[PDB]
Short mmCIF file of all heavy atoms in Angstrom, two decimals:
data_model
loop_
_atom_site.label_atom_id
_atom_site.label_comp_id
_atom_site.label_asym_id
_atom_site.label_seq_id
_atom_site.Cartn_x
_atom_site.Cartn_y
_atom_site.Cartn_z
N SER A 1 0.84 -1.20 -0.03
CA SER A 1 0.03 0.01 0.00
C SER A 1 0.88 1.24 0.00
O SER A 1 1.82 1.34 0.85
CB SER A 1 -0.94 0.01 1.23
OG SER A 1 -1.77 -1.13 1.23
N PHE A 2 0.57 2.17 -0.91
CA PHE A 2 1.19 3.51 -0.85
C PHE A 2 0.87 4.25 0.50
O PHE A 2 -0.28 4.40 0.83
CB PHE A 2 0.74 4.39 -1.99
CG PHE A 2 1.46 4.17 -3.31
CD1 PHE A 2 2.48 3.29 -3.43
CD2 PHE A 2 1.05 4.99 -4.43
CE1 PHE A 2 3.15 3.17 -4.64
CE2 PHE A 2 1.76 4.89 -5.64
CZ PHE A 2 2.80 3.96 -5.79
N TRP A 3 1.91 4.76 1.15
CA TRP A 3 1.77 5.83 2.06
C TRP A 3 1.95 7.20 1.25
O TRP A 3 3.12 7.58 1.03
CB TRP A 3 2.73 5.77 3.24
CG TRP A 3 2.60 6.88 4.21
CD1 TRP A 3 3.39 8.02 4.25
CD2 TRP A 3 1.67 7.03 5.27
NE1 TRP A 3 2.96 8.84 5.23
CE2 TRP A 3 1.93 8.23 5.95
CE3 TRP A 3 0.63 6.20 5.76
CZ2 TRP A 3 1.17 8.67 6.99
CZ3 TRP A 3 -0.13 6.62 6.85
CH2 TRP A 3 0.17 7.86 7.47
N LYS A 4 0.86 7.78 0.86
CA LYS A 4 0.86 8.93 -0.07
C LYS A 4 1.52 8.52 -1.39
O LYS A 4 1.88 7.35 -1.50
CB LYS A 4 1.64 10.13 0.60
CG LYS A 4 1.05 10.53 1.94
CD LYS A 4 1.72 11.84 2.46
CE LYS A 4 1.05 12.26 3.79
NZ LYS A 4 1.65 13.61 4.25
N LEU A 5 1.61 9.39 -2.35
CA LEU A 5 2.31 9.05 -3.58
C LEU A 5 3.78 9.07 -3.32
O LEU A 5 4.28 9.59 -2.31
CB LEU A 5 1.89 10.05 -4.68
CG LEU A 5 0.40 10.13 -5.01
CD1 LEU A 5 0.22 11.36 -5.94
CD2 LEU A 5 -0.14 8.84 -5.57
N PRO A 6 4.63 8.56 -4.30
CA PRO A 6 6.06 8.76 -4.16
C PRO A 6 6.41 10.21 -3.99
O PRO A 6 5.68 11.09 -4.45
CB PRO A 6 6.63 8.14 -5.50
CG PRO A 6 5.61 7.18 -5.91
CD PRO A 6 4.25 7.77 -5.47
N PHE A 7 7.41 10.50 -3.17
CA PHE A 7 7.72 11.91 -2.76
C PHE A 7 8.50 12.62 -3.83
O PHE A 7 9.68 12.96 -3.68
CB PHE A 7 8.41 11.94 -1.40
CG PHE A 7 7.63 11.29 -0.32
CD1 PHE A 7 8.02 10.13 0.31
CD2 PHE A 7 6.37 11.85 0.06
CE1 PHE A 7 7.23 9.51 1.28
CE2 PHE A 7 5.57 11.16 1.02
CZ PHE A 7 5.98 10.06 1.63
N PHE A 8 7.81 12.87 -4.99
CA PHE A 8 8.43 13.56 -6.10
C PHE A 8 9.07 14.88 -5.71
O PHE A 8 10.07 15.29 -6.31
CB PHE A 8 7.40 13.81 -7.20
CG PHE A 8 6.73 12.55 -7.69
CD1 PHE A 8 5.38 12.33 -7.43
CD2 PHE A 8 7.47 11.58 -8.33
CE1 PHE A 8 4.72 11.18 -7.91
CE2 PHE A 8 6.85 10.41 -8.76
CZ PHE A 8 5.48 10.21 -8.54
N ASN A 9 8.49 15.61 -4.71
CA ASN A 9 8.95 16.92 -4.43
C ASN A 9 9.85 16.94 -3.14
O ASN A 9 10.27 18.02 -2.74
CB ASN A 9 7.76 17.86 -4.25
CG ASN A 9 7.03 18.12 -5.56
OD1 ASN A 9 7.57 17.84 -6.65
ND2 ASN A 9 5.79 18.66 -5.48
N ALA A 10 10.15 15.77 -2.57
CA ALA A 10 10.97 15.77 -1.40
C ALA A 10 12.34 16.40 -1.73
O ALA A 10 12.94 16.09 -2.71
CB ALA A 10 11.20 14.37 -0.87
N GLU A 11 12.80 17.31 -0.82
CA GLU A 11 14.14 17.83 -1.04
C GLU A 11 15.16 17.42 0.03
O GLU A 11 16.37 17.50 -0.27
CB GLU A 11 14.10 19.36 -1.02
CG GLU A 11 13.33 19.97 -2.17
CD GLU A 11 13.61 21.44 -2.28
OE1 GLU A 11 14.61 21.74 -2.98
OE2 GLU A 11 12.96 22.23 -1.58
N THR A 12 14.78 17.00 1.22
CA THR A 12 15.62 16.56 2.27
C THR A 12 15.27 15.20 2.79
O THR A 12 14.10 14.81 2.74
CB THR A 12 15.61 17.58 3.43
OG1 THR A 12 14.32 17.52 4.10
CG2 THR A 12 15.88 18.98 2.98
N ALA A 13 16.22 14.48 3.35
CA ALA A 13 15.99 13.23 3.95
C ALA A 13 15.05 13.40 5.15
O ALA A 13 14.27 12.49 5.49
CB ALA A 13 17.30 12.54 4.38
N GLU A 14 15.15 14.53 5.90
CA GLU A 14 14.33 14.81 7.05
C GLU A 14 12.84 14.72 6.70
O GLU A 14 12.02 14.10 7.44
CB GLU A 14 14.68 16.14 7.64
CG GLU A 14 16.02 16.20 8.37
CD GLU A 14 17.27 16.36 7.51
OE1 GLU A 14 17.22 16.45 6.23
OE2 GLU A 14 18.35 16.44 8.16
N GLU A 15 12.41 15.25 5.54
CA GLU A 15 11.02 15.27 5.19
C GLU A 15 10.54 13.83 5.05
O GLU A 15 9.46 13.48 5.45
CB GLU A 15 10.79 15.98 3.82
CG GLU A 15 11.21 17.45 3.89
CD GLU A 15 11.28 18.14 2.52
OE1 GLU A 15 11.58 17.50 1.53
OE2 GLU A 15 11.08 19.37 2.46
N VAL A 16 11.41 12.94 4.48
CA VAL A 16 11.05 11.58 4.32
C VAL A 16 10.96 10.87 5.67
O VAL A 16 10.04 10.08 5.91
CB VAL A 16 12.04 10.89 3.34
CG1 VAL A 16 11.61 9.40 3.12
CG2 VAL A 16 12.04 11.65 2.07
N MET A 17 11.93 11.17 6.55
CA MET A 17 11.86 10.53 7.90
C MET A 17 10.66 10.93 8.65
O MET A 17 10.06 10.13 9.38
CB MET A 17 13.18 10.89 8.69
CG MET A 17 14.45 10.38 8.01
SD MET A 17 14.45 8.61 7.77
CE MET A 17 14.49 8.11 9.52
N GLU A 18 10.17 12.15 8.51
CA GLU A 18 8.91 12.61 9.17
C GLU A 18 7.75 11.83 8.63
O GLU A 18 6.83 11.40 9.43
CB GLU A 18 8.70 14.16 8.91
CG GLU A 18 9.55 15.00 9.80
CD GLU A 18 9.57 16.45 9.34
OE1 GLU A 18 8.87 16.79 8.40
OE2 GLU A 18 10.35 17.26 9.94
N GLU A 19 7.70 11.48 7.33
CA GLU A 19 6.61 10.68 6.78
C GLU A 19 6.75 9.21 7.29
O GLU A 19 5.72 8.57 7.50
CB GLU A 19 6.63 10.66 5.25
CG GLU A 19 6.17 11.99 4.67
CD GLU A 19 4.70 12.33 4.85
OE1 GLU A 19 3.89 11.46 5.32
OE2 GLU A 19 4.33 13.51 4.56
N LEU A 20 7.96 8.69 7.40
CA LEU A 20 8.13 7.36 7.98
C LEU A 20 7.57 7.27 9.37
O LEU A 20 6.83 6.35 9.71
CB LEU A 20 9.60 6.94 7.94
CG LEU A 20 9.90 5.58 8.69
CD1 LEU A 20 9.26 4.36 7.93
CD2 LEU A 20 11.45 5.40 8.75
N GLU A 21 7.94 8.29 10.24
CA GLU A 21 7.41 8.33 11.55
C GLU A 21 5.85 8.36 11.54
O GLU A 21 5.24 7.60 12.35
CB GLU A 21 7.96 9.59 12.28
CG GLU A 21 9.46 9.58 12.43
CD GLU A 21 10.11 10.86 12.95
OE1 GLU A 21 9.33 11.74 13.43
OE2 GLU A 21 11.38 10.97 12.88
N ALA A 22 5.26 9.15 10.70
CA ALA A 22 3.81 9.20 10.62
C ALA A 22 3.23 7.87 10.17
O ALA A 22 2.18 7.42 10.70
CB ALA A 22 3.33 10.31 9.67
N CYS A 23 3.87 7.18 9.17
CA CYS A 23 3.32 5.92 8.78
C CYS A 23 3.42 4.86 9.84
O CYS A 23 2.51 4.05 10.03
CB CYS A 23 4.05 5.51 7.41
SG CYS A 23 3.42 3.99 6.73
N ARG A 24 4.53 4.86 10.57
CA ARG A 24 4.69 3.76 11.53
C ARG A 24 3.82 4.01 12.76
O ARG A 24 3.33 3.08 13.32
CB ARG A 24 6.22 3.53 11.84
CG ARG A 24 6.83 4.49 12.83
CD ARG A 24 8.43 4.29 12.82
NE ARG A 24 9.11 5.34 13.46
CZ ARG A 24 10.38 5.66 13.35
NH1 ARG A 24 11.23 4.90 12.60
NH2 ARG A 24 10.87 6.72 13.97
N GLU A 25 3.50 5.24 13.10
CA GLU A 25 2.55 5.56 14.13
C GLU A 25 1.12 5.22 13.69
O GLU A 25 0.32 4.69 14.44
CB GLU A 25 2.63 7.06 14.56
CG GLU A 25 4.03 7.37 15.06
CD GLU A 25 4.14 8.79 15.67
OE1 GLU A 25 3.17 9.51 15.75
OE2 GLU A 25 5.28 9.14 16.02
N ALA A 26 0.79 5.41 12.41
CA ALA A 26 -0.57 5.08 11.87
C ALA A 26 -0.70 3.59 11.65
O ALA A 26 -1.82 3.09 11.65
CB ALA A 26 -0.80 5.82 10.63
N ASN A 27 0.40 2.80 11.41
CA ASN A 27 0.28 1.43 11.00
C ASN A 27 1.34 0.60 11.78
O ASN A 27 2.19 -0.05 11.17
CB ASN A 27 0.54 1.31 9.44
CG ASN A 27 -0.38 2.15 8.64
OD1 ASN A 27 -1.55 1.84 8.51
ND2 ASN A 27 0.12 3.22 8.03
N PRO A 28 1.23 0.57 13.08
CA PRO A 28 2.24 -0.15 13.90
C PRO A 28 2.22 -1.66 13.71
O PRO A 28 3.23 -2.30 14.14
CB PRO A 28 1.88 0.25 15.31
CG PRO A 28 0.36 0.41 15.26
CD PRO A 28 0.15 1.08 13.95
N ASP A 29 1.16 -2.19 13.15
CA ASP A 29 1.04 -3.59 12.83
C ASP A 29 1.55 -4.01 11.47
O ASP A 29 1.41 -5.19 11.12
CB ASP A 29 -0.42 -4.04 13.04
CG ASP A 29 -1.41 -3.20 12.09
OD1 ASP A 29 -1.06 -1.95 11.76
OD2 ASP A 29 -2.45 -3.74 11.69
N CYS A 30 2.11 -3.09 10.70
CA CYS A 30 2.51 -3.33 9.35
C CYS A 30 4.02 -3.28 9.17
O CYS A 30 4.72 -2.71 9.97
CB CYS A 30 1.92 -2.28 8.42
SG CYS A 30 0.12 -2.49 8.28
N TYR A 31 4.49 -4.06 8.20
CA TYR A 31 5.84 -3.82 7.67
C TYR A 31 5.81 -2.56 6.79
O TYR A 31 4.85 -2.35 6.11
CB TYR A 31 6.31 -5.01 6.78
CG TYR A 31 6.48 -6.29 7.55
CD1 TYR A 31 5.43 -6.97 8.03
CD2 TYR A 31 7.81 -6.74 7.85
CE1 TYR A 31 5.61 -8.18 8.76
CE2 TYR A 31 8.01 -7.90 8.55
CZ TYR A 31 6.90 -8.60 9.01
OH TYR A 31 7.14 -9.78 9.72
N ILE A 32 6.88 -1.75 6.91
CA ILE A 32 6.97 -0.49 6.25
C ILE A 32 8.28 -0.46 5.56
O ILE A 32 9.37 -0.66 6.14
CB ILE A 32 6.80 0.72 7.21
CG1 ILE A 32 5.49 0.52 7.98
CG2 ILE A 32 6.91 2.03 6.42
CD1 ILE A 32 5.26 1.60 9.10
N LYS A 33 8.30 -0.13 4.20
CA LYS A 33 9.51 -0.11 3.39
C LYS A 33 9.70 1.29 2.81
O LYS A 33 8.71 1.97 2.55
CB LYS A 33 9.47 -1.22 2.34
CG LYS A 33 8.47 -0.96 1.14
CD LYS A 33 8.62 -2.08 0.08
CE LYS A 33 7.53 -1.98 -0.97
NZ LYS A 33 7.58 -3.18 -1.87
N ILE A 34 10.97 1.62 2.65
CA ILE A 34 11.37 2.77 1.89
C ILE A 34 11.70 2.33 0.45
O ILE A 34 12.42 1.38 0.29
CB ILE A 34 12.66 3.43 2.48
CG1 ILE A 34 12.36 3.96 3.88
CG2 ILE A 34 13.12 4.54 1.54
CD1 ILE A 34 11.39 5.14 3.87
N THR A 35 11.12 3.09 -0.52
CA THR A 35 11.45 2.78 -1.93
C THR A 35 12.28 3.93 -2.55
O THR A 35 12.22 5.09 -2.05
CB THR A 35 10.17 2.55 -2.71
OG1 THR A 35 9.35 3.74 -2.59
CG2 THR A 35 9.38 1.36 -2.16
N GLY A 36 13.00 3.61 -3.59
CA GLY A 36 13.84 4.60 -4.24
C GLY A 36 13.69 4.36 -5.75
O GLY A 36 14.25 3.41 -6.26
N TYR A 37 12.97 5.25 -6.43
CA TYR A 37 12.60 5.01 -7.84
C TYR A 37 13.37 5.88 -8.75
O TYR A 37 13.49 7.09 -8.56
CB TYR A 37 11.10 5.25 -8.06
CG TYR A 37 10.59 4.56 -9.32
CD1 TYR A 37 10.39 3.24 -9.39
CD2 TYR A 37 10.35 5.34 -10.46
CE1 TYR A 37 10.00 2.55 -10.54
CE2 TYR A 37 9.89 4.68 -11.68
CZ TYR A 37 9.72 3.30 -11.69
OH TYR A 37 9.27 2.59 -12.78
N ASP A 38 13.89 5.29 -9.88
CA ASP A 38 14.62 6.05 -10.86
C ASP A 38 13.70 6.13 -12.13
O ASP A 38 13.55 5.11 -12.87
CB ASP A 38 15.93 5.42 -11.23
CG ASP A 38 16.64 6.08 -12.38
OD1 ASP A 38 16.37 7.25 -12.63
OD2 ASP A 38 17.56 5.43 -12.95
N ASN A 39 13.11 7.28 -12.41
CA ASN A 39 12.25 7.42 -13.58
C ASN A 39 13.02 7.36 -14.85
O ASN A 39 12.45 7.11 -15.93
CB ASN A 39 11.47 8.72 -13.53
CG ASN A 39 12.31 9.94 -13.64
OD1 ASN A 39 13.24 10.09 -12.87
ND2 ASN A 39 12.07 10.73 -14.65
N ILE A 40 14.35 7.50 -14.78
CA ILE A 40 15.16 7.52 -16.06
C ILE A 40 15.23 6.06 -16.62
O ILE A 40 15.29 5.80 -17.80
CB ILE A 40 16.56 8.08 -15.84
CG1 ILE A 40 16.44 9.54 -15.28
CG2 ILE A 40 17.38 8.05 -17.13
CD1 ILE A 40 15.49 10.41 -16.04
N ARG A 41 15.35 5.09 -15.73
CA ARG A 41 15.34 3.64 -16.15
C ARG A 41 13.96 3.00 -15.92
O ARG A 41 13.88 1.86 -16.36
CB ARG A 41 16.38 2.92 -15.37
CG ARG A 41 15.95 2.47 -13.98
CD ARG A 41 17.14 1.84 -13.25
NE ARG A 41 18.16 2.79 -12.85
CZ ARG A 41 19.34 2.50 -12.37
NH1 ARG A 41 19.76 1.24 -12.28
NH2 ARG A 41 20.21 3.49 -12.01
N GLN A 42 13.02 3.69 -15.37
CA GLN A 42 11.72 3.13 -14.99
C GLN A 42 11.88 1.89 -14.12
O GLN A 42 11.31 0.84 -14.41
CB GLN A 42 10.86 2.75 -16.24
CG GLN A 42 10.52 3.92 -17.14
CD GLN A 42 11.63 4.15 -18.21
OE1 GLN A 42 11.74 3.27 -19.09
NE2 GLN A 42 12.30 5.21 -18.18
N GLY A 43 12.56 2.05 -12.98
CA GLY A 43 12.72 0.91 -12.09
C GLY A 43 13.15 1.29 -10.72
O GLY A 43 13.83 2.38 -10.54
N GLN A 44 12.82 0.52 -9.73
CA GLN A 44 13.29 0.72 -8.36
C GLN A 44 14.83 0.45 -8.33
O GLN A 44 15.30 -0.49 -8.94
CB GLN A 44 12.60 -0.19 -7.32
CG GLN A 44 11.19 0.26 -7.08
CD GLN A 44 10.52 -0.34 -5.90
OE1 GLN A 44 11.22 -0.91 -5.02
NE2 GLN A 44 9.21 -0.32 -5.84
N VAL A 45 15.57 1.35 -7.67
CA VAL A 45 16.97 1.19 -7.55
C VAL A 45 17.41 0.87 -6.09
O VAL A 45 18.55 0.50 -5.91
CB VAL A 45 17.75 2.46 -8.02
CG1 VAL A 45 17.59 2.64 -9.50
CG2 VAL A 45 17.16 3.70 -7.37
#
């Protein structure tokens, strides 16, 4: 399940860590993964 869309506009790692914190507080019973997408190759890196 997406936690929001991919963070196309993220500029700092801190912004992403704040979303991770929100996701794990909202979904403490879930596995939560960080993804890293390269639109140039159309694939997760």
Side-chain angles (χ1 to χ4, degrees):
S1 300
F2 276 0
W3 179 262
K4 304 186 176 186
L5 303 171
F7 300 114
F8 304 113
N9 292 344
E11 295 195 90
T12 68
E14 286 83 357
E15 300 169 330
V16 181
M17 298 302 293
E18 284 165 4
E19 291 290 353
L20 173 65
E21 298 172 11
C23 183
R24 78 192 168 197
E25 302 187 3
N27 304 286
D29 56 330
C30 289
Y31 294 74
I32 304 172
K33 70 177 172 189
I34 296 293
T35 59
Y37 199 74
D38 174 22
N39 65 304
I40 303 312
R41 80 185 74 191
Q42 299 92 64
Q44 287 192 18
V45 292

